[PDB]
């Protein structure tokens, strides 16, 4: 009954988080000081918004965490009566708290809440701010209204640079003494894409699945289109060759890959490909157009063939 590595290697203090260094340092300044403002943390998944908010709440409250901290989440019902009752009478309650430490309402996945939920949120966070402070977590700030981002301090978490993902990955691997190859670990970076929980789960998964951490094992337990094949496809589309890229297309189509994953890996490889900048812009526009062809419901091999033809003709 061993715990998974996502929850086993969760940080317990605020200096173990490698996401955004200035924001983490200012959060630690507020943890040692006490008067934490209303904060909202935005960014891609896996950057560590939940562990930053949880570690801030723990380092603030301590032993009074079970009564001075309310964690409302997406798996719980968040209707109009919930923001009318649960959040309100948590914000109205009294807790014997120190001079600087304040009550915390951890509102994880605030972008999934309805409009009336945020309508009942706004007055609560403006009025009861002498006692309770809201630490919102979210993925996209567009689904949240502008007034909540106005009354909060917005903390943009970036997608993680691969170096800090490597440092945490050597920390976990040295904690487990799991053998590795280097290129397999770079394959784990490529499978992560700024999602650190995805990197940990894929490493976990892959070792339990197949011993040595080598490109073959991680690319077997994931089964995305291979970076070398799609990179050679885009390279064959660079020098105006429809046929040589079409053997790679038939290789990736007779392997049973769905067209959505094919075009997603095509765009992700085309993001970092070494070619001319205007040519990269035209390629990204055509890959986007074929991706709307896919998303509208035309998932044939001939749409991939037409994508290859358009990338070939745009290179003279």
């Amino acid at each position: 009954y061993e715990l998974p590595w996502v929850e086993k290697y969760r940080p317990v203090k605020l200096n173990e988080i490698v996401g955004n260094e200035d924001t983490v340092s200012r959060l630690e300044v507020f943890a040692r000081e006490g008067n934490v403002p209303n904060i909202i943390i935005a960014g891609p998944p896996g950057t560590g918004k939940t562990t930053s908010i949880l570690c801030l709440a723990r380092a603030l409250l301590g032993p009074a965490l079970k009564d001075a901290m309310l964690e409302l989440n997406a798996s719980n019902d968040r209707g109009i009566d919930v923001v009318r009752n649960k959040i309100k009478m948590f914000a109205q309650q009294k807790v014997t708290l120190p001079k600087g430490r304040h009550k915390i309402i951890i509102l994880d996945e605030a972008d999934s809440m309805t409009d009336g939920a945020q309508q009942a949120l706004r007055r609560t966070m403006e009025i009861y701010s002498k006692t309770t402070r809201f630490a919102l977590a979210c993925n996209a700030s567009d689904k949240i209204i502008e007034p909540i981002q106005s009354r909060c301090a917005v903390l943009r978490y970036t997608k993680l640079t691969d170096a800090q993902i490597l440092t945490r990955l050597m920390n976990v691997i040295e904690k487990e003494r799991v053998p590795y190859t280097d290129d397999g670990l770079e394959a784990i970076i490529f499978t992560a894409q700024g999602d650190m929980r995805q990197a940990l789960n894929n490493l976990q998964s892959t070792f339990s699945g197949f011993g040595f951490i080598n490109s073959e094992n991680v690319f077997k337990v994931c089964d995305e289109p291979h970076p070398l094949l799609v990179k050679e496809m885009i390279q064959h589309c660079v020098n105006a060759n429809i046929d040589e890229a079409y053997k790679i297309l038939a290789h990736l189509w007779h392997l049973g890959y769905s067209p959505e994953d094919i075009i997603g890996n095509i765009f992700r490889v085309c993001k970092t490909f070494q070619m001319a900048e205007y040519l990269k812009l035209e390629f990204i526009k055509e890959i986007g157009y074929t991706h709307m062809k896919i998303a509208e419901g035309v998932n044939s091999l001939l749409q991939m063939a037409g994508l290859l033809a358009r990338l070939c003709q745009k290179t003279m």
């Binding site: 403002p37 600087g100 007055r123 701010s129 002498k130 700030s141 943009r156 997603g264 157009y289």
Partner: protein
Amino acid sequence: NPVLRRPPILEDYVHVTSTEGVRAYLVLRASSHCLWVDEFAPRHYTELLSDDFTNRCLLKWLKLWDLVVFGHESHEQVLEEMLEAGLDPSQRPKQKVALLCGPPGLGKTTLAHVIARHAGYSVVEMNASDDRSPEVFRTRIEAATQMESVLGAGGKPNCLVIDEIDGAPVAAINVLLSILNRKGLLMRPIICICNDQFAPSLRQLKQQAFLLHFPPTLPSRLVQRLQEVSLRQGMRADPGVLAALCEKTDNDIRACINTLQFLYGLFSVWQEVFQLPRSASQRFYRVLHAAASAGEHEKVVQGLFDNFLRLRLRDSSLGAVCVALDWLAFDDLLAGAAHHSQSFQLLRYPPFLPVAFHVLFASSHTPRITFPSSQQEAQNRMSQMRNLIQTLVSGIAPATRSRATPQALLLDALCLLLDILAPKLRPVSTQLYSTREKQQLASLVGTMLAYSLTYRQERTPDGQYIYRLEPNVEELCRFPELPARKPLTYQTKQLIAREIEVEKMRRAEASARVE
């Protein structure tokens, strides 16, 4: 060579003919206790941060409401004139309810609270969509108002301050309208706050409500107030980051005070896109990471559309503007299709829209990057034009509304109508007019009675009067850069207006006589 006219030796082949037929074959193989927004709340009128015209106007409105609850006896001049536009015989103002609106974080709630505390009113708040049923809204709407005070020898009264009724369900605004239009009578002032002015639930409210649309705050008083906050809190006085920060948040007090409280974006991304810093793949990856970490792409793209042509472009093929327009339209197409197909896989491309601009408009010259977006003003103008044309087509009686489409009315049947309604008439009395002018006036008054428009007097700010249209239909017909036509005179307009009112009592008397 892939094509041979000779037949293959031992493989499969496909024939190919032409219009001539050569037949070639192909192989098939409490300092630390409260926020900085709470300790720096103005407790008196002297330290307010809003437009002085708006504060004076609301103070004068709540100073003229004191008649019936205490017993004591340009757009700006339009607002001042409807402030003093008479009084109802039951001593209420003609503007019963206020509808202050605008963007978040300026201080509408703070202004309303300190004005209510200034005008001898006990403050009482309301969130509208907090309790979203008709019945609880009805109970609070006849409990917060329509009541005296329990304390002592009267004490002080209360005025209802409804917040967040922009998102209120339509039954709540219907209950508020039915309690406003009763003629048991509404006596306490109601101060409503709405974030979106053009919400469809709020359209019937404005037609009766007082309107105080908030202008944005001037950055100079913003900078000196933020400097006062920094010197009081012991922060270092660096006004450049204060001015830039306040430019980034569109002059929102909550954002800058919360950010400077946290400290102890838009313009950086725009400056990286529109000017190279003092390999090309390095700045490509830098602007890609900057556009990925920018997050909010709607305002970024909206500001990029209002700045990409203002640069000093020397393009002799206008090719870059065409490519940037194709990129912007591609982003529009992709956002619409990702809304339609509900796919999150398409949401990784609009970060490549500003990056593309850095490949196209990497002007070395120091760019005049303008923060206000004209696309937002154009959207607001289109929206208020849309409300005006629905108001106009609601004005028509069903007889003609039936004969034509509002689209056809706007495109083909309104400017020519105005041109009909602006004839050449001598400025003489109606008795001195001839018979032909009399039946022309009869035709004009019939057209106005069928269309339900009239002429209403208003005070020009020079001290004299002028006559305007009742729905003011010229702003959706005429255009600013046209050769201006001669308008009608004062005397003709006022004699036509008395003919309008005379025909109105005329038709009222005949409808009473028939029934």
